[PDB]
Subunit: 497 residues, 3 copies
């Protein structure tokens, strides 16, 4: 019996075929999905988690292998001579780095194995001398000569660069719940933050001045679920950054009195601290958890922030601005709690369409409401009501905090992730709930037995989801028993975390 | 009987508590809203309008009080010596300002009380000498020495910087209709524009070159309801600004022949005019009111714009571009009028869900349709149909004008605030109306008496709204009787404006 | 019988009048639409296609006429002397161009009619000497002296600058289907790309260094249907561009080793090639057509891209990144095919509201489902289901490709045009389909004969659409018979293309 592709083929006169064969498929209609080559993912869901093979660059300790065609054992200078031709910009970068140029060194006292590093740190020093045994480093290499910065980079808790990949990719519902090729960018964004030292000061220049700029953060620290770049950019600080970036001195260390305009790094890597999370009052799951940072119990952290602001402001002004945040955040949660009551009420009254049993199982293998304890809050493969709910708490409520934290007058109120966007989302949620309730009331009165449509449960994409193949004993709970890393409180973790 | 918080508490094992106590509330579910400390707002709705106390910085004439812990009467140089340590960037800014550095003065002839100002204008000159009686200035201070710029800053009409706060915060429906902490950024954005001289050339450098850049405007002149920054930025002018900003001479006055690339200030503060509103053809409520700026009655203003463009263009080309605006704007209103007919038709047929009596009262205390005379057009605490209507007229239709005015080919057509966004919004409006009509038709036929859900009327946020507490005699109509400021035509103004 | 305007007039106390008379119409409610002055459009739909007269600047060969008031025959230097006063920036630009300044010439060997061009190329050389017979050039002028660049500019296929206007304005459904003043920016954006040489290096400086910057492309290469600027900008390449733009050497030709940071022009105008389309693997209708660019048949193009990336990367790394694109793209089409099945299923079951006969005819004059062969896929004047479908394939699916092509980790996954936006759009589509099916099921059971509302078919804007006036013989099929340009496969082309 014909598939969608089969029928499309009969209509468009293009044969059905595999997506991967190079055919230009008209609106992709007659193409069949082919699973890409995978490698096994790590972590507690290693029984089914996959990665694309290009994970080799980002978790090289577990995936890196020789894939070079060039043979030989070479000295540093030979690496440079050939790569001047073969990858010129890498050499140009390296020649403009302190590693490759003594002229710009600052005599900071770098040591390896207790001995001063006075030579060039060349290609072979970081990648190995044998071209068939090249190394793809992590912070572990950098630790050899930069232990202070590495220790700090490794000092964060859950929600920091430190466990971005190990915990918050490998344990994370939205990542583990999707086909690997859909979420490659998630693995890499989070893995760059954790495993590398090049997220802010990029290879191969490794220039701290570059790392001080907002461009060192905004590729990752952006978007609908954590819009801090946009919040910063739409503050007067951000406008002044844009106004002054071209002519200001970026060569100054991030210290009181060295900058007129504060950047991400100025406020979050104060005095060059490589554990930027630590200045935060408390981890709040991106502002989805409500906390009044101006409460007496958080006075030390609030006072610290006020003192940071006092580099360039009255501390009274700074205190007032952070109180505005506290107040704005508290007001924002009234709208979320309204939304949550409406949404859960629909579920409890059994009027959500689809109900959980009418959707594909969640990534746990459960037919459980996403906005209930044990559920999987999400924006995909779920009801419209649940999607809107997730958007309310994650995209909007969380970002109200970010808007206030970063002094974006517009995004606190009108703009993306604002009070007024919350208002509109709340209307949408109530609209969905109202529709659901009216349909159910009508169907009950006329004795129409409504069944949710099959497209909520099955489809070309839905059928790929891991929920379908979850089975008892498929969780590596020993991973969750580990105490050397934090963990996410997943429903099927099976142990104490 | 249990509240949402109570039930959540029983499920999540986290006690109910006040939002402000510092507890990290899981999804904010068990937190209770606590009203922040307020001060009374000013204006015609002073009987219930509130502000957060941090309004002290932005309407200091009515709210500023001593809040310093430092005592003493100091000379200018003493301010500097201590603040070099205590707020270094303020001192650094000031030292780089003409106020604090004679070397960059231009001999413009500044006078105070008819006498030339030849000395430094120091911290104490602007803030006072007594640290327990420090002053937080407005344009009134600046007027002492810069009467021309101040007079112009104070010469605008409604819709200008001049009355941004006094009228368009204190009289404005969306501001007065919401809890104060929700709209702090509104008060401050508008108050910075009105009461300060630092919106464009920031303190403490007060650098006109900074004020010439689009960064001097875009923090405020952005977003879904007035997207002129995005419109400018997505024009060739805006692209050239980005291309040339780093190397161009920003030290030149905004005059014909001094710039290749026009900025906001170039076109709207022509020849340094500090009443930027005046170059506009006519105030149109952000493009929500339809006016053909190319009509004979507006020839003087159109000719003036053409002559401005002629700094760098054929006047025929400029005339053609502004005619494109006129035509594009006129076409855009056909879609709004379509939407309005659909929406009002739903109300007149009584098929909106909720109907106004099913929602919380509007900020006037009325159960009145928002898109009818006397109603309160809005995006919050209203029906989905009404929300979509407001979005159509304000977010989209108004911004089509901005897209054309600023030569954004993309945003005129495809992009944010465009013709095609209007198209999609119109489909959405018709979709909502269609759903409403189908439900009503079904319910009528089967004799189901539909009542709008209680969540349209009551909820944790909805219950905070001022509409609930409005009562006869709660408007200060004497404020509206004032002829020394313009006014908004509010439904409960009670007098002639 | 009263129109909307008539009724509004009785309520607001503002007379009905033509939109163009200069009246400030309250919410545009009582204004009547007046058709702007048009000129006839060119192309196969010339029988009804219109343009605003300002098309004169963009298709000057067919529309340019004298419109100057200045008389005289002048020498180059006289043009300059007067225009120094009359249009100073044009002269300033020209004086800073190689055309107007021998000092910055590079001796490249420019010839006209086989003879070296050693003089200044002045205003009169490009525009003519007679001020009543001034010329408005296209690439045809530039060809006189820059044949190589012009030939390349003219070497592209469909989907390139080369036919942007001639084919993809004049034959394009969304353009020909709308009133001319609505889509002026479409005509001009596409005409600037095709007919001019100033899209990237603007007049009158014609500076290649400017053309190398992303600002040379992003005014056009942006937005919801082709967001490559945003994709680039949210890649590490884009962040580094922003970090380095102010201080980097933009005077270097776009060659291996000359740049650390790649721009649009670096990758798509490799070695100064003025046919940027040619580096693309295959034209895929902006990613709406599915093709695996990593398939064996595309090896040459894939290898070429890998070698380009190898300017600054391992070719293995580059190969891996482009494989990530292939995989991400293939996954993205599963969601589109899901959506398409749901949407077409609704049509085949006759439950779309409106059905095509309930909407205004499409621009062909047909009452045909937009997402069926022969239909007109669109976001306007169609059902909500069809609008959402178009958004899914065009705005989202197409941009997933762009997100991967440009290394935007965030926009591949979370952001604009991402996997997760596809997820949410798919929920929306299923939500619309579910609603449609539930209404139809209820109406069938209770014997309610539902007719789609008249507002789907008629309205102030809908009534302006060309579909209403289409008639047999109104297509210039001789245009489509042309073999010297490619064509769009329009339903009423009437001949082989
Ligand atoms: C240590 C200080 C390094 C030196 C010296 C050089 N490289 Fe490097 N390189 C380094 C790291 C830590 C990484 C991993 C990625 C990251 O950002 O952390 C890399 C990566 C590469 C790659 C692959 C990535 C790519 O862009 O293709 C190549 C091909 C590479 N490095 C080559 C290279 C050459 C030729 C060098 C000498 C001129 C060189 N590297 C210096 C760390 C270090
Ligand atoms: C100082 C003026 C800041 C600048 C510049 C930027 N941010 Fe910030 N950030 C700042 C504050 C006062 C806060 C609230 C912290 C508190 O505990 O009160 C934040 C918050 C964040 C967060 C969340 C941190 C947390 O929840 O603990 C992030 C991830 C963040 N900021 C990132 C960030 C980026 C990327 C910035 C540049 C674009 C940036 N911040 C600017 C202070 C300041
Ligand atoms: C962004 C979050 C960063 C990450 C991740 C890493 N570094 Fe960094 N680094 C960053 C900034 C903003 C600065 C300048 C800080 C300042 O005070 O101005 C730096 C600086 C360094 C330095 C120079 C130290 C010195 O004594 O001058 C080194 C040696 C350094 N960084 C190393 C380093 C290592 C080893 C990292 C991984 C563990 C690493 N950095 C990550 C920003 C960021
Ligand atoms: C960079 C381009 C990112 C991509 C892609 C993904 N996310 Fe992310 N993540 C990013 C940042 C900067 C932040 C921190 C914001 C803050 O205020 O802390 C986040 C955080 C989330 C977290 C925490 C969510 C929580 O418990 O509240 C997790 C678990 C997470 N990110 C994982 C993750 C994965 C795997 C993604 C794809 C499925 C997703 N992120 C996209 C930026 C990066
Ligand atoms: C007049 C020309 C001024 C001089 C000289 C100095 N300041 Fe000022 N300051 C001025 C104004 C008009 C304002 C109000 C805010 C605005 O933008 O209009 C301020 C503000 C302050 C503040 C509070 C705001 C903050 O950022 O914390 C402080 C603490 C302050 N000013 C201090 C200060 C010092 C120490 C000065 C001498 C070095 C100084 N100001 C000069 C106007 C003027
Ligand atoms: C000249 C090339 C301009 C530049 C640069 C910017 N704007 Fe503009 N603006 C311009 C015109 C011709 C118009 C239409 C005015 C008319 O009467 O025809 C506008 C409109 C505005 C408005 C609305 C003004 C009104 O309705 O009276 C605002 C608020 C505005 N522009 C702001 C603005 C900003 C913030 C800009 C930089 C980002 C900017 N404009 C650029 C001309 C030009
Ligand atoms: C943005 C809307 C501004 C506001 C609000 C204020 N100023 Fe301004 N100022 C602005 C610009 C763009 C410029 C340069 C204009 C030009 O022609 O290039 C200026 C300049 C000044 C100057 C210098 C005047 C001179 O003779 O050189 C002064 C003294 C000045 N501005 C003062 C001033 C005052 C007192 C303000 C509040 C009343 C004020 N400015 C507001 C932009 C803007
Ligand atoms: C700066 C960050 C703003 C915030 C926050 C708010 N608005 Fe605003 N306002 C802003 C600008 C630049 C404009 C002018 C746009 C133009 O084309 O004129 C506006 C204008 C509105 C107006 C006029 C609306 C009308 O009658 O048509 C008012 C009444 C208004 N703004 C008030 C207001 C308040 C109080 C806000 C929160 C409730 C809101 N604005 C956000 C920019 C600033
Ligand atoms: C050829 C190399 C040129 C020279 C020398 C000058 N101009 Fe030009 N101009 C040229 C072209 C190809 C165009 C069409 C637009 C495009 O971008 O392709 C133009 C346009 C104009 C216009 C109208 C457009 C406008 O911005 O108003 C004018 C008024 C104009 N040009 C005037 C002008 C003057 C005075 C010149 C000498 C100083 C001059 N141009 C030089 C190409 C060329
Ligand atoms: C190199 C690092 C690039 C930069 C910088 C930019 N783009 Fe790109 N683009 C690049 C690749 C590898 C691809 C995929 C091509 C393939 O066949 O695999 C693309 C794609 C595009 C397209 C579509 C081309 C097509 O489908 O044939 C466009 C229109 C495009 N890119 C434009 C563009 C712009 C405007 C950029 C700057 C903002 C830009 N690209 C950057 C490589 C690179
Ligand atoms: C963007 C897509 C462009 C369009 C359209 C046109 N040009 Fe261009 N041009 C562009 C770039 C990025 C560059 C620099 C390329 C490099 O290798 O760095 C150029 C350069 C030129 C030159 C200089 C050639 C030389 O020998 O140095 C010329 C003479 C030139 N361009 C002419 C030209 C003409 C005639 C065009 C229309 C047919 C044209 N360009 C369009 C970018 C773009
Ligand atoms: C510049 C400001 C644009 C506007 C306005 C319009 N479009 Fe466009 N068009 C633009 C670009 C950069 C691209 C290329 C993207 C790529 O990846 O190739 C497009 C492409 C479309 C195409 C092809 C659609 C197809 O068959 O798949 C056409 C037909 C098209 N553009 C036409 C067109 C018209 C006439 C518009 C208004 C109705 C529309 N575009 C807006 C950028 C420009
Ligand atoms: O369930 C969570 C975190 C929820 C994370 C979000 C869930 C919804 C969207 C994706 C991220 N917990 C345990 C709650 O009992 C987090 C805890 C916090 O203190 C941190 O860790």
């Amino acid at each position: 019996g014909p598939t969608f592709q089969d029928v499309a083929s009969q209509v468009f006169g293009q044969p059905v075929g595999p997506d991967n064969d190079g055919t230009l498929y008209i609106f992709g209609l007659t193409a069949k999905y082919t699973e890409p080559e995978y490698v096994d993912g790590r972590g507690p869901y290693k029984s089914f988690l996959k990665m694309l093979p290009s994970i080799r660059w980002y978790d090289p300790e577990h995936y890196w292998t020789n894939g070079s065609q060039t043979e030989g054992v070479f000295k540093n200078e030979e690496c440079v001579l050939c790569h001047t031709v073969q990858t010129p910009t890498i050499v140009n970068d390296w020649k403009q780095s302190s590693h490759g140029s003594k002229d710009i060194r600052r005599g900071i006292g770098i040591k390896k194995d207790g001995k001063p590093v006075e030579d060039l740190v060349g290609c072979a020093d970081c990648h190995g001398n044998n071209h068939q045994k090249l190394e793809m480093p992590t912070y572990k290499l950098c630790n050899d000569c930069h232990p202070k910065e590495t220790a700090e980079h490794r000092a964060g808790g859950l929600g920091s660069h430190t466990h971005a990949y190990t915990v918050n990719v490998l344990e994370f519902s939205w990542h583990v719940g999707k086909p690997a090729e859909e979420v490659t960018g998630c693995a890499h964004c989070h893995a760059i933050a954790e495993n590398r030292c090049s997220g802010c000061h990029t290879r191969h220049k490794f220039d701290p001045a570059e790392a001080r700029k907002p461009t060192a953060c905004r590729v990752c620290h952006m978007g609908i679920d954590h819009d801090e770049w946009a919040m910063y950019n739409t503050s007067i600080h951000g406008a002044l950054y844009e106004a002054e970036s071209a002519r200001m001195d970026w060569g100054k260390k991030l210290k009181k009195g060295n900058y007129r305009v504060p950047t991400c790094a100025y406020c979050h890597m104060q005095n060059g601290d490589h554990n930027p999370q630590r200045f935060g009052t408390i981890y709040s799951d991106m502002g989805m958890f409500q906390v009044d940072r101006g409460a007496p119990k958080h006075k030390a952290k609030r006072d610290s922030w006020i003192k940071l602001c006092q580099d360039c402001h009255s501390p009274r002004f700074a205190a007032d601005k952070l109180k505005e945040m506290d107040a704005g955040v508290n007001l924002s949660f009234t709208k979320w709690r309204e939304a949550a009551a409406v949404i859960v009420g629909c579920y409890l009254d059994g009027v959500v369409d689809p109900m959980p049993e009418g959707s594909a199982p969640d990534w746990y293998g459960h037919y459980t409401f996403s906005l209930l304890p044990g559920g999987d809050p999400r924006f995909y493969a779920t009801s419209n009501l649940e999607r809107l709910g997730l958007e309310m708490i994650c995209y909007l409520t969380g970002n109200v905090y970010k808007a206030y934290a970063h002094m974006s007058m517009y995004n606190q109120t009108y703009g993306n992730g604002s009070a007024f966007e919350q208002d509109r989302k709340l209307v949408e949620i109530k609209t969905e709930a109202a529709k659901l309730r009216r349909f159910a009331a009508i169907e009950k009165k006329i004795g129409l037995e409504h069944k949710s449509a099959d497209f909520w449960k099955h489809g070309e994409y839905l059928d790929l989801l891991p929920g379908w193949k979850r089975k008892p004993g498929d969780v590596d709970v020993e991973w969750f028993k580990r105490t050397d890393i934090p963990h996410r409180a997943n429903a099927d973790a099976g142990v104490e975390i």
